[PDB]
Design brief:
By secondary structure, the chain is an alpha/beta fold. The protein contains twelve helices and nine strands. The protein has one domain: Alpha-Beta Barrel (TIM Barrel), CATH 3.20.20.80. Strands 1-2-3-4-5-6-8-9 form an eight-stranded parallel barrel, surrounded by five helices. α9 links the parallel β5 and β6. α6 runs parallel beside α8 and α11 packs parallel to α12.
């Protein structure tokens, strides 16, 4: 048995990661706990479109490289988040449409991936393209209005820019096998495999809460996507109230699926969370371990 999350996951050939924010790196409790416990890092905001290309053709990697360097200095691998998304676009990109937008999307992917070529193990190439609800439709955005092929174009561009990276599609509310959103994602991945569109992984954000609760059929979802020929990953896990039982169930679901790469929790302490009022993480505000921490560690250790 191992005494830290990352080391315990590594015994099954998997990882246990977190989200890191550059503004929190002066807090010694945060950096020492994150350093000890996790073997994979995602930048919370610093690799988004607005942060990396604030003006067209003018790239800024200062904050992104602060997070990247912290990770490598502390023995962690890095997941890149995210290259093409409807949210957090800089103003200059919000103003573009059609072919002009398509070329700017391509240039953005090429510029960011070139800076990190061979250094980032997984990329969230496209994020959150499906609508919520019963339709299974694509979400409305400038990207989607440019044509249904925008997602395929982003993946083909990314494969050529860095052939060593695993390329993921990432979304939320896609964990329950019976939901229309889940089935729309399934049909997209099946079509991409038939037609030779490069896609290596699917990311399940796994934001579980009262409106989008955990279901035992999550294991069925993971197995059915893996059977299409993709790896699966849990990318932004948090659970309202941090119940020990649900945290253990999600961990066991990943361990039961041969192509489940690992789990990232979306922050360190409850006070670091984007939804801090829902106390949804594994560490208390003082850095102490919650009951859910013990349930996850025990599941990883068998």
């Amino acid at each position: 048995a191992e005494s830290t999350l990352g080391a315990a996951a590594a015994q099954s050939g998997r990882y246990f990661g977190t989200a890191i924010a550059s503004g929190r790196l002066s807090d010694s409790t945060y950096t020492s706990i994150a350093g000890r416990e996790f073997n994979m890092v995602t930048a919370e905001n610093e690799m988004k479109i607005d942060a990396t290309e604030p003006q067209r053709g003018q790239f800024n990697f200062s904050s992104a490289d602060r997070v990247y360097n912290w990770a490598v200095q502390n023995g962690k691998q890095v997941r890149g988040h995210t290259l093409a998304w409807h949210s957090q676009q800089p103003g200059w990109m919000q103003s573009l449409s059609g072919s002009a937008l398509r070329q700017a999307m391509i240039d953005h992917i090429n510029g960011v991936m070139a800076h990190y070529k061979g250094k980032i193990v997984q990329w969230d190439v496209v994020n959150e393209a499906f609508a919520d609800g019963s339709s299974g439709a694509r979400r409305d955005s400038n990207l989607q209005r440019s044509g249904n092929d925008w997602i395929e174009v982003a993946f083909r561009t990314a494969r050529a820019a860095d052939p060593s990276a695993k390329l993921c599609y990432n979304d939320y509310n896609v964990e329950n096998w019976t939901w229309a959103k889940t089935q729309a994602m399934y049909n997209m991945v099946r079509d991409f495999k038939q037609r030779g569109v490069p896609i290596d992984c699917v990311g399940f954000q796994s934001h579980f809460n009262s409106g989008s609760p955990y279901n035992s059929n999550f294991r069925t979802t993971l197995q059915n996507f893996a059977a299409l020929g993709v790896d699966v990953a849990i990318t932004e896990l948090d659970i309202q109230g941090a119940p020990a039982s649900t945290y253990a169930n999600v961990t066991n679901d990943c361990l039961a699926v041969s192509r489940c790469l690992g789990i990232t929790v979306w922050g360190v302490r409850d006070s670091d969370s984007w939804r801090s009022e829902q106390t949804p993480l594994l560490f208390n505000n003082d850095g102490s371990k919650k009951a859910a921490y013990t349930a996850v560690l025990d599941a990883l250790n068998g």
